[PDB]
Protein backbone atom coordinates (compact mmCIF):
# COMPACT_ATOMS: atom_id res chain seq x y z
CA UNK A 1 0.00 0.00 0.00
CA UNK A 2 1.90 3.06 -1.23
CA UNK A 3 1.75 6.59 0.28
CA UNK A 4 1.12 5.26 3.81
CA UNK A 5 3.57 5.31 6.72
CA UNK A 6 4.56 2.04 8.43
CA UNK A 7 5.11 1.35 12.13
CA UNK A 8 8.49 -0.08 13.20
CA UNK A 9 8.15 -3.84 13.11
CA UNK A 10 9.58 -6.84 14.95
CA UNK A 11 13.11 -7.87 13.88
CA UNK A 12 12.59 -11.06 11.91
CA UNK A 13 8.96 -11.80 12.73
CA UNK A 14 9.25 -12.99 16.33
CA UNK A 15 10.60 -11.84 19.70
CA UNK A 16 11.90 -14.36 22.21
CA UNK A 17 12.21 -18.14 22.57
CA UNK A 18 9.84 -21.07 21.83
CA UNK A 19 8.72 -21.33 25.47
CA UNK A 20 7.40 -17.76 25.46
CA UNK A 21 3.68 -18.21 24.85
CA UNK A 22 1.51 -15.92 22.74
CA UNK A 23 -0.86 -13.97 24.99
CA UNK A 24 -4.27 -13.74 23.28
CA UNK A 25 -6.39 -10.58 23.16
CA UNK A 26 -9.36 -10.42 25.53
CA UNK A 27 -12.86 -11.53 24.65
CA UNK A 28 -14.47 -8.79 22.56
CA UNK A 29 -17.50 -10.59 21.14
CA UNK A 30 -18.92 -7.46 19.51
CA UNK A 31 -16.05 -7.78 17.03
CA UNK A 32 -15.99 -11.56 17.19
CA UNK A 33 -19.04 -13.78 17.47
CA UNK A 34 -21.68 -11.08 16.95
CA UNK A 35 -20.07 -9.93 13.71
CA UNK A 36 -20.58 -13.45 12.37
CA UNK A 37 -24.32 -12.97 12.94
CA UNK A 38 -24.48 -9.63 11.13
CA UNK A 39 -22.80 -11.27 8.14
CA UNK A 40 -25.18 -14.19 7.72
CA UNK A 41 -28.23 -11.98 8.17
CA UNK A 42 -27.32 -9.84 5.18
CA UNK A 43 -26.40 -12.91 3.13
CA UNK A 44 -29.64 -14.80 3.76
CA UNK A 45 -31.54 -11.69 2.69
CA UNK A 46 -29.93 -10.52 -0.56
CA UNK A 47 -30.05 -14.03 -2.05
CA UNK A 48 -33.90 -14.53 -2.06
CA UNK A 49 -34.68 -10.87 -2.67
CA UNK A 50 -32.41 -10.84 -5.69
CA UNK A 51 -34.14 -13.94 -6.99
CA UNK A 52 -37.37 -11.93 -6.87
CA UNK A 53 -35.66 -9.25 -8.94
CA UNK A 54 -35.26 -11.27 -12.13
CA UNK A 55 -38.65 -13.00 -11.83
CA UNK A 56 -40.44 -9.63 -11.86
CA UNK A 57 -41.42 -7.91 -15.10
CA UNK A 58 -41.77 -4.24 -14.20
CA UNK A 59 -40.15 -2.48 -11.26
CA UNK A 60 -40.52 -3.59 -7.67
CA UNK A 61 -42.86 -1.92 -5.22
CA UNK A 62 -41.22 0.75 -3.06
CA UNK A 63 -41.74 -1.39 0.04
CA UNK A 64 -40.14 -4.48 -1.52
CA UNK A 65 -37.32 -2.33 -2.92
CA UNK A 66 -36.45 -0.30 0.16
CA UNK A 67 -35.95 -3.51 2.12
CA UNK A 68 -33.73 -4.74 -0.72
CA UNK A 69 -31.69 -1.54 -0.84
CA UNK A 70 -30.67 -1.43 2.80
CA UNK A 71 -29.60 -5.08 2.75
CA UNK A 72 -27.38 -4.51 -0.27
CA UNK A 73 -25.66 -1.73 1.67
CA UNK A 74 -24.99 -3.90 4.70
CA UNK A 75 -23.71 -6.68 2.47
CA UNK A 76 -21.17 -4.49 0.69
CA UNK A 77 -20.25 -2.84 3.98
CA UNK A 78 -19.27 -6.14 5.61
CA UNK A 79 -16.95 -7.03 2.71
CA UNK A 80 -15.22 -3.66 2.52
CA UNK A 81 -14.81 -3.89 6.27
CA UNK A 82 -12.98 -7.21 6.20
CA UNK A 83 -10.75 -5.96 3.40
CA UNK A 84 -9.70 -3.20 5.81
CA UNK A 85 -8.74 -5.40 8.74
CA UNK A 86 -7.04 -7.89 6.40
CA UNK A 87 -4.81 -5.53 4.44
CA UNK A 88 -4.59 -2.13 6.17
CA UNK A 89 -4.06 -3.70 9.56
CA UNK A 90 -2.96 -2.08 12.78
CA UNK A 91 0.42 -3.68 13.50
CA UNK A 92 1.84 -2.22 10.30
CA UNK A 93 -0.05 1.05 9.84
CA UNK A 94 -1.16 2.05 13.30
CA UNK A 95 -3.58 4.94 13.45
CA UNK A 96 -4.47 4.72 9.75
CA UNK A 97 -6.44 1.56 10.40
CA UNK A 98 -8.89 3.73 12.34
CA UNK A 99 -8.96 6.59 9.86
CA UNK A 100 -9.70 4.27 6.94
CA UNK A 101 -12.50 2.81 9.05
CA UNK A 102 -13.92 6.33 9.29
CA UNK A 103 -13.97 6.70 5.51
CA UNK A 104 -16.47 3.83 5.66
CA UNK A 105 -18.43 6.15 7.97
CA UNK A 106 -19.14 9.46 6.25
CA UNK A 107 -18.67 7.86 2.83
CA UNK A 108 -21.40 5.38 3.61
CA UNK A 109 -23.73 7.47 5.75
CA UNK A 110 -24.29 9.73 2.74
CA UNK A 111 -25.08 6.63 0.71
CA UNK A 112 -28.05 5.98 2.96
CA UNK A 113 -29.39 9.45 2.22
CA UNK A 114 -28.75 8.81 -1.48
CA UNK A 115 -31.18 5.90 -1.34
CA UNK A 116 -33.80 8.24 0.13
CA UNK A 117 -33.63 10.33 -3.04
CA UNK A 118 -34.11 7.18 -5.14
CA UNK A 119 -37.06 5.66 -3.29
CA UNK A 120 -39.27 8.77 -3.12
CA UNK A 121 -38.38 11.02 -6.05
CA UNK A 122 -37.40 8.30 -8.53
CA UNK A 123 -38.09 4.55 -8.43
CA UNK A 124 -35.66 2.30 -6.58
CA UNK A 125 -32.21 0.91 -7.29
CA UNK A 126 -33.45 -1.95 -9.46
CA UNK A 127 -35.24 0.71 -11.45
CA UNK A 128 -31.94 2.50 -11.95
CA UNK A 129 -29.83 -0.49 -12.97
CA UNK A 130 -32.44 -1.68 -15.46
CA UNK A 131 -32.78 1.83 -16.87
CA UNK A 132 -29.21 2.00 -18.14
CA UNK A 133 -29.45 -1.44 -19.74
CA UNK A 134 -28.44 -5.12 -18.99
Amino acid sequence: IPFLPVLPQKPGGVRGTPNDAYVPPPENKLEGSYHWYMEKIFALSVVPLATTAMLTTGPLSTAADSFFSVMLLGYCYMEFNSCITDYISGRVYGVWHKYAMYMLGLGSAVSLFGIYKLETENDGVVGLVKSLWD
Partner: protein, 238 residues
Amino acid sequence: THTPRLKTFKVYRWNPDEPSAKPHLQSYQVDLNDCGPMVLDALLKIKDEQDSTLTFRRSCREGICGSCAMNIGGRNTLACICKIDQNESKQLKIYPLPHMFIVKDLVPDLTNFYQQYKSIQPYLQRSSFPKDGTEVLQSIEDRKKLDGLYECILCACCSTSCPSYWWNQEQYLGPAVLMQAYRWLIDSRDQATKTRKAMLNNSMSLYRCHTIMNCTRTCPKGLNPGLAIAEIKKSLAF
Protein backbone atom coordinates in the same frame (compact mmCIF):
# COMPACT_ATOMS: atom_id res chain seq x y z
CA THR B 1 25.48 -51.60 -19.48
CA HIS B 2 23.45 -49.10 -17.45
CA THR B 3 23.26 -46.00 -19.62
CA PRO B 4 22.91 -43.07 -17.21
CA ARG B 5 19.74 -40.99 -17.20
CA LEU B 6 20.10 -37.44 -15.89
CA LYS B 7 17.33 -35.43 -14.25
CA THR B 8 18.07 -31.85 -13.19
CA PHE B 9 17.00 -30.69 -9.73
CA LYS B 10 16.77 -26.94 -9.07
CA VAL B 11 17.26 -26.25 -5.36
CA TYR B 12 16.78 -22.88 -3.65
CA ARG B 13 19.96 -21.61 -1.96
CA TRP B 14 21.03 -19.00 0.57
CA ASN B 15 24.07 -18.57 2.76
CA PRO B 16 23.70 -16.32 5.80
CA ASP B 17 27.42 -15.64 6.18
CA GLU B 18 27.17 -13.58 2.99
CA PRO B 19 23.68 -12.05 3.24
CA SER B 20 24.47 -9.46 0.56
CA ALA B 21 23.90 -12.11 -2.11
CA LYS B 22 20.49 -12.83 -3.53
CA PRO B 23 18.75 -16.20 -3.12
CA HIS B 24 18.96 -18.17 -6.32
CA LEU B 25 18.36 -21.58 -7.84
CA GLN B 26 21.18 -24.03 -8.48
CA SER B 27 21.10 -26.99 -10.86
CA TYR B 28 22.26 -30.48 -9.91
CA GLN B 29 22.31 -33.45 -12.29
CA VAL B 30 21.41 -36.71 -10.53
CA ASP B 31 21.95 -40.11 -12.13
CA LEU B 32 18.44 -41.48 -11.71
CA ASN B 33 19.45 -45.15 -11.94
CA ASP B 34 21.33 -45.52 -8.64
CA CYS B 35 18.92 -43.45 -6.58
CA GLY B 36 15.88 -44.26 -4.50
CA PRO B 37 12.28 -43.77 -5.57
CA MET B 38 11.68 -40.63 -3.43
CA VAL B 39 12.96 -37.07 -3.35
CA LEU B 40 14.79 -37.35 -0.01
CA ASP B 41 16.72 -40.24 -1.52
CA ALA B 42 17.78 -37.79 -4.24
CA LEU B 43 18.55 -34.84 -1.97
CA LEU B 44 20.86 -37.03 0.12
CA LYS B 45 22.77 -38.28 -2.93
CA ILE B 46 23.56 -34.66 -3.77
CA LYS B 47 24.97 -34.08 -0.29
CA ASP B 48 27.16 -37.19 -0.45
CA GLU B 49 28.66 -37.07 -3.93
CA GLN B 50 28.49 -33.35 -4.74
CA ASP B 51 28.25 -29.97 -3.00
CA SER B 52 27.62 -30.69 0.68
CA THR B 53 26.82 -27.13 1.70
CA LEU B 54 23.15 -28.05 1.22
CA THR B 55 21.22 -28.12 4.50
CA PHE B 56 17.75 -29.46 5.26
CA ARG B 57 15.88 -31.32 7.98
CA ARG B 58 15.21 -35.06 7.97
CA SER B 59 14.77 -37.65 10.61
CA CYS B 60 12.90 -40.97 9.85
CA ARG B 61 12.26 -41.40 6.10
CA GLU B 62 8.76 -42.85 6.74
CA GLY B 63 6.44 -39.84 6.98
CA ILE B 64 5.49 -39.57 10.67
CA CYS B 65 7.69 -36.81 12.31
CA GLY B 66 7.08 -33.95 9.88
CA SER B 67 10.61 -32.57 9.59
CA CYS B 68 11.27 -32.50 5.92
CA ALA B 69 8.23 -30.66 4.67
CA MET B 70 9.05 -28.38 1.76
CA ASN B 71 7.47 -27.04 -1.43
CA ILE B 72 8.30 -29.69 -4.02
CA GLY B 73 7.24 -28.90 -7.55
CA GLY B 74 4.45 -26.51 -6.75
CA ARG B 75 2.70 -27.85 -3.65
CA ASN B 76 3.58 -28.29 0.00
CA THR B 77 4.37 -31.95 0.68
CA LEU B 78 6.72 -34.22 2.63
CA ALA B 79 10.00 -34.96 0.90
CA CYS B 80 10.15 -38.70 1.94
CA ILE B 81 6.72 -39.50 0.54
CA CYS B 82 6.87 -37.37 -2.64
CA LYS B 83 7.91 -39.56 -5.53
CA ILE B 84 10.12 -38.66 -8.46
CA ASP B 85 8.43 -39.26 -11.79
CA GLN B 86 10.84 -41.39 -13.80
CA ASN B 87 10.87 -39.08 -16.83
CA GLU B 88 14.24 -37.45 -17.38
CA SER B 89 13.14 -34.73 -19.78
CA LYS B 90 11.53 -32.32 -17.28
CA GLN B 91 13.20 -30.57 -14.37
CA LEU B 92 12.20 -30.14 -10.72
CA LYS B 93 12.09 -27.05 -8.50
CA ILE B 94 12.43 -27.42 -4.71
CA TYR B 95 11.63 -24.40 -2.54
CA PRO B 96 11.26 -23.87 1.21
CA LEU B 97 7.86 -23.45 2.84
CA PRO B 98 6.26 -20.31 1.40
CA HIS B 99 6.35 -16.99 3.29
CA MET B 100 8.59 -17.92 6.22
CA PHE B 101 11.80 -16.19 7.30
CA ILE B 102 14.31 -18.82 6.20
CA VAL B 103 17.49 -19.66 8.13
CA LYS B 104 20.15 -21.20 5.87
CA ASP B 105 18.95 -23.09 2.76
CA LEU B 106 15.63 -24.94 3.08
CA VAL B 107 15.12 -24.48 6.84
CA PRO B 108 12.36 -22.02 7.82
CA ASP B 109 12.16 -20.35 11.21
CA LEU B 110 9.22 -22.08 12.89
CA THR B 111 9.55 -20.19 16.17
CA ASN B 112 6.29 -18.27 15.89
CA PHE B 113 4.55 -21.58 15.24
CA TYR B 114 5.73 -23.10 18.54
CA GLN B 115 4.54 -20.08 20.52
CA GLN B 116 1.06 -20.37 19.04
CA TYR B 117 0.78 -24.10 19.74
CA LYS B 118 1.64 -23.43 23.39
CA SER B 119 -1.25 -21.00 23.77
CA ILE B 120 -4.23 -23.29 23.13
CA GLN B 121 -3.23 -25.21 26.29
CA PRO B 122 -2.77 -28.75 24.95
CA TYR B 123 -3.40 -30.66 28.17
CA LEU B 124 -6.35 -32.14 30.03
CA GLN B 125 -8.14 -29.99 32.54
CA ARG B 126 -10.42 -32.09 34.73
CA SER B 127 -10.91 -31.65 38.45
CA SER B 128 -11.76 -35.11 39.84
CA PHE B 129 -10.82 -38.75 39.28
CA PRO B 130 -12.58 -41.99 40.32
CA LYS B 131 -12.33 -43.24 43.86
CA ASP B 132 -10.76 -46.66 43.34
CA GLY B 133 -7.91 -45.10 41.36
CA THR B 134 -8.83 -46.59 38.00
CA GLU B 135 -9.10 -44.80 34.66
CA VAL B 136 -11.84 -42.39 33.65
CA LEU B 137 -14.64 -43.91 31.57
CA GLN B 138 -15.42 -43.17 27.94
CA SER B 139 -17.72 -45.09 25.59
CA ILE B 140 -16.86 -46.11 22.04
CA GLU B 141 -19.05 -43.56 20.24
CA ASP B 142 -17.28 -40.77 22.12
CA ARG B 143 -13.92 -42.26 21.26
CA LYS B 144 -14.99 -42.31 17.61
CA LYS B 145 -15.17 -38.50 17.54
CA LEU B 146 -11.40 -38.08 17.88
CA ASP B 147 -10.50 -40.13 14.81
CA GLY B 148 -8.96 -37.74 12.33
CA LEU B 149 -7.91 -35.17 14.90
CA TYR B 150 -5.24 -36.62 17.19
CA GLU B 151 -3.11 -37.99 14.34
CA CYS B 152 -1.64 -34.68 13.09
CA ILE B 153 2.14 -34.55 13.10
CA LEU B 154 2.64 -30.74 13.28
CA CYS B 155 4.48 -30.24 9.93
CA ALA B 156 2.90 -26.86 8.92
CA CYS B 157 2.15 -27.81 5.35
CA CYS B 158 -1.39 -26.63 5.95
CA SER B 159 -0.67 -23.36 7.78
CA THR B 160 1.81 -22.14 5.17
CA SER B 161 -0.56 -22.56 2.27
CA CYS B 162 -3.39 -20.39 3.59
CA PRO B 163 -3.53 -16.85 2.20
CA SER B 164 -4.76 -15.44 5.51
CA TYR B 165 -1.74 -16.94 7.27
CA TRP B 166 0.53 -15.48 4.60
CA TRP B 167 -0.33 -11.95 5.67
CA ASN B 168 -1.72 -11.98 9.23
CA GLN B 169 0.44 -14.78 10.60
CA GLU B 170 1.27 -12.89 13.79
CA GLN B 171 -2.29 -12.82 15.08
CA TYR B 172 -4.17 -15.55 13.16
CA LEU B 173 -3.55 -19.01 14.58
CA GLY B 174 -3.47 -20.99 11.36
CA PRO B 175 -5.30 -24.16 10.39
CA ALA B 176 -2.88 -26.45 12.24
CA VAL B 177 -3.37 -24.89 15.67
CA LEU B 178 -7.11 -24.37 15.25
CA MET B 179 -7.62 -28.08 14.68
CA GLN B 180 -5.77 -28.91 17.90
CA ALA B 181 -7.93 -26.36 19.70
CA TYR B 182 -10.83 -28.53 18.54
CA ARG B 183 -9.31 -31.85 19.68
CA TRP B 184 -9.58 -30.59 23.19
CA LEU B 185 -13.09 -29.23 22.82
CA ILE B 186 -14.80 -32.45 21.77
CA ASP B 187 -12.94 -34.68 24.20
CA SER B 188 -15.58 -36.15 26.49
CA ARG B 189 -13.40 -35.85 29.61
CA ASP B 190 -12.17 -32.26 29.37
CA GLN B 191 -14.53 -30.40 31.65
CA ALA B 192 -13.37 -26.82 31.12
CA THR B 193 -14.62 -25.55 27.76
CA LYS B 194 -15.90 -22.12 28.78
CA THR B 195 -12.28 -20.95 28.73
CA ARG B 196 -11.21 -22.85 25.62
CA LYS B 197 -14.09 -21.16 23.78
CA ALA B 198 -13.15 -17.69 25.00
CA MET B 199 -9.64 -17.02 23.69
CA LEU B 200 -10.91 -17.57 20.14
CA ASN B 201 -13.70 -14.98 20.36
CA ASN B 202 -11.74 -11.87 19.42
CA SER B 203 -11.41 -9.98 16.15
CA MET B 204 -8.66 -12.00 14.42
CA SER B 205 -7.83 -15.39 15.81
CA LEU B 206 -10.49 -17.69 14.39
CA TYR B 207 -12.37 -15.28 12.13
CA ARG B 208 -9.71 -14.56 9.56
CA CYS B 209 -10.77 -17.77 7.81
CA HIS B 210 -12.64 -17.28 4.53
CA THR B 211 -13.07 -21.00 3.62
CA ILE B 212 -10.54 -20.94 0.66
CA MET B 213 -9.49 -24.38 1.54
CA ASN B 214 -5.97 -24.99 0.40
CA CYS B 215 -5.47 -26.76 3.75
CA THR B 216 -7.64 -29.85 3.25
CA ARG B 217 -6.15 -30.05 -0.28
CA THR B 218 -2.46 -30.20 0.66
CA CYS B 219 -2.32 -32.11 4.03
CA PRO B 220 -0.06 -35.14 3.25
CA LYS B 221 -1.54 -37.27 6.02
CA GLY B 222 -5.03 -36.98 4.57
CA LEU B 223 -6.77 -35.15 7.40
CA ASN B 224 -9.28 -32.28 7.26
CA PRO B 225 -8.28 -29.05 8.99
CA GLY B 226 -10.86 -27.05 7.03
CA LEU B 227 -13.92 -28.85 8.29
CA ALA B 228 -12.57 -28.76 11.85
CA ILE B 229 -12.51 -24.96 11.78
CA ALA B 230 -16.11 -24.68 10.57
CA GLU B 231 -17.33 -26.63 13.59
CA ILE B 232 -15.80 -24.15 16.01
CA LYS B 233 -17.62 -21.31 14.25
CA LYS B 234 -20.86 -23.29 14.36
CA SER B 235 -20.30 -23.79 18.10
CA LEU B 236 -19.23 -20.25 19.04
CA ALA B 237 -22.47 -18.90 17.60
CA PHE B 238 -24.88 -21.65 18.64
